[model samples]
Target: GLAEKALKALILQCEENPSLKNDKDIHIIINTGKKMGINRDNIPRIIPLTKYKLFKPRDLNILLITKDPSALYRETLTKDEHTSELFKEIISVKNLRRRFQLYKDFDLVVADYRVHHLLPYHGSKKLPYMIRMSKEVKLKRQQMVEKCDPIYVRAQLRSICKNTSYIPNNDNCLSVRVGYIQKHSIPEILQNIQDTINFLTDKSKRPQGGVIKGGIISIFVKTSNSTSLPIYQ
Candidate 1:
């Protein structure tokens, strides 16, 4: 369990330190008792910190690729497919490198579930960030566009991007960003820390296994320049 009093003490100490007083943010170190062998392909390299909105959302560039090209053009049209214009235009540019560069330009590559079979020839797996829109969600063409709205995509992108700030793939320990000290209070940061740890330890979240198989040995909190203060064991 995480202690609020301990976290407050750490924050109080940072307040006392003249040099560290104006520092930006707090990071929580999560130490797993054993190393988990994680493959980038099978296992996601980053863990999304979804419980709390610690970071601001950005306007993400999105590329919507679907079997039903009409959805991209006619927002009102509901889920029916066959070519319009965009389909032929994108496929005409046959250069793999150019295709790779084109796809890379977007922050997220949203592909249709049905169109996945054809993506391999175009090397879709190489896309840095992508999410598939399954048939259930894509029942309405307008629904597809609705899903890509900034409000909807912001949280998705934020969670994915936030975790990348610290990659835990190779080691048993990794630091997770809490919030900026200036913007959040001690209780807010403590809640974020607790949520992060709970997400990391849940079996439902980590079914591939071994990430805290031995359980958490220690948890520490630290500000920008301060030394880590243990809060849990």
Candidate 2:
């Protein structure tokens, strides 16, 4: 196969994302099917294909919980401080500065102060992962649990912007990536909240079809011209 044009002239002299070798999605359809032979088990079924979702920006799957997890400590730090119930063995509830987090994909919420609630779910740990609701919010999260190894370290959302210092920061926003969830701990954060409640009742995928809509992540923000994204509310 003469190494296919000597590896396309050694991938255009070390491609380096060289604007997709002048585009075609991938060098002349697998080197013209190995010069009209079509091997490699159908060159991966002859290309082009995919299928998926997203809810974007710190995907905190509707966790706008309005305080009360013990005021995430410092309920009154007038002098030295309130280890805030010993900040729950290290950020059991607090913000960066107990829990309340939100900032470009670094989700990981719920903070009463166990050392910065696992420092933003482990710094960039990010969580959320809300299946759906409407069943009166799953009958108000199954009547607020009650116990028996339950693991939703506190969650809730509706009239969001419940706090986050009044949820204003984008100034003028718009953004998207369409995917990613990686907080590692607490059993992978309650197994991504039980695989987003087994992928929202219908039980799988993708989402209730929407956990959020603005800032456009699924359709992936019109491909922002560049360096911008915030517009939600």
Candidate 3:
């Protein structure tokens, strides 16, 4: 796939410049068809980057909001309380205006499945950057809540943050996190790019007879402070 070709070029460019690699910020920018915005149903709100797990522990300061009081002892519960008290104060704000400051201190929010329902106040209003653990069986939920699973938190939090975090998609252009150069090999990064593109344009996810071709107008590889390099036309 051309993903390999383009990613290689970026690497080559980095070798010559050196600063791109030093910055450690990389992403794949996808520009979809203009008149026809991407079908939101085709992709999940948060895509777990299973192929190339790039996030390091220091990358995000996670805030896990759970119902269980014992979760406070876990090492992952850093900046704030994991008990019901903060959860109550957060959801208690009926007005959306005041709740913005609650999440500003943390990089990402991880809510226990038990408390997930109470966080949102009806309607398809976009939530703050957050993800919930899978709902456990009622019988096992108690046992599972006693301890925090670092493995699950890493997988769930290492997700595409742009799509569902904040921006309400009222436009055609979309940019998703594919991989970081420091955490992955070239092939792994390329595979992530390919898989992400395939996931976004899969025919099975769309309506019948909708041509998957040309849905994307252009594809580019970008670093936080650098120019976007084109991968596709």
Candidate 4:
């Protein structure tokens, strides 16, 4: 529902703004899950219609990252080779440093890290270990942020666990618990959590999410820079 609502809003917003009509500077890709009933098993049939003239060739390229590449391949009866070729046609392969450089030229890059290693790491190790690693990553990312200007980070719950402590409230950071808001559609729940975090941090910014049944609280910290902070070693 959120995806549909978001898409509809985007189209309406674009139509209302004449400046965006021929802008050709925006990129949009919808990533969905079958369990969530968004992308479902039919992706090949969906791509062509969705790839309307949103932007010019040099402007933006929308790339979809599904839950499992193998699953999409199987359902669509498309060979892995075909899919691989399609992806290569869309984006260039580059290291993290180079990838950050590409990000600078794009308007939007919506992605989901269900299979991402970074998010889960915060849940597995001690807060100090996370802090150490995060510091390293931040150094590298800082350069990207500085070059790109402002940014928004929707933190995860696993990152804001009780023992965890990292908040993205630097001069150019905006931290919001989008996971909490999406999971629980309650205004008070969101407000209460934010207020509690404000209290605990003593007016300092805190991470997102709280402890759940059989789950630990987590913290999320986002920074804007080209290189991530030095966390390892």
The order of the candidates by lDDT, greatest first, is 1, 3, 4, 2
Tens-place lDDT digits, model 2, residues 123-148? 12233222111132335557573321
lDDT of each candidate versus the true structure? 0.53, 0.24, 0.52, 0.25
TM-scores for candidates 1 onward, in order: 0.54, 0.22, 0.57, 0.20
Candidate 1 residue-wise lDDT, 1-233, digit = tens: 35777677767777788988767567877787776555434213454555456644233344445454434433422222321211122221122223544555644443443454445321132243343332225455553445323223334445554443334354677666776766678777777776677767777866522255557888888876887888887
Clash numbers, per candidate: 1, 32, 0, 35
Give per-residue lDDT, candidate 2, residue 116.
29
RMSD of each: 9.0, 17.9, 7.5, 20.1
lDDT of 2 at 106: 29
- How do the residues 45-83 of candidate 3 rate in per-residue lDDT, one tens digit apiece? 543344556454346555555554433423343333432
Q: Largest lDDT belongs to which candidate?
A: 1
Q: Say which prediction, candidate 2 or candidate 3, comes out ahead on lDDT.
A: 3
Which segments of model 1 are wrong by more than 4 Å?
A: 39-51, 58-137, 142-152, 158-166, 208-210
Cand. 3 Cα-lDDT: 0.52
Best by TM-score: 3
Worst-scoring 10-residue span by lDDT in model 1: 84-93
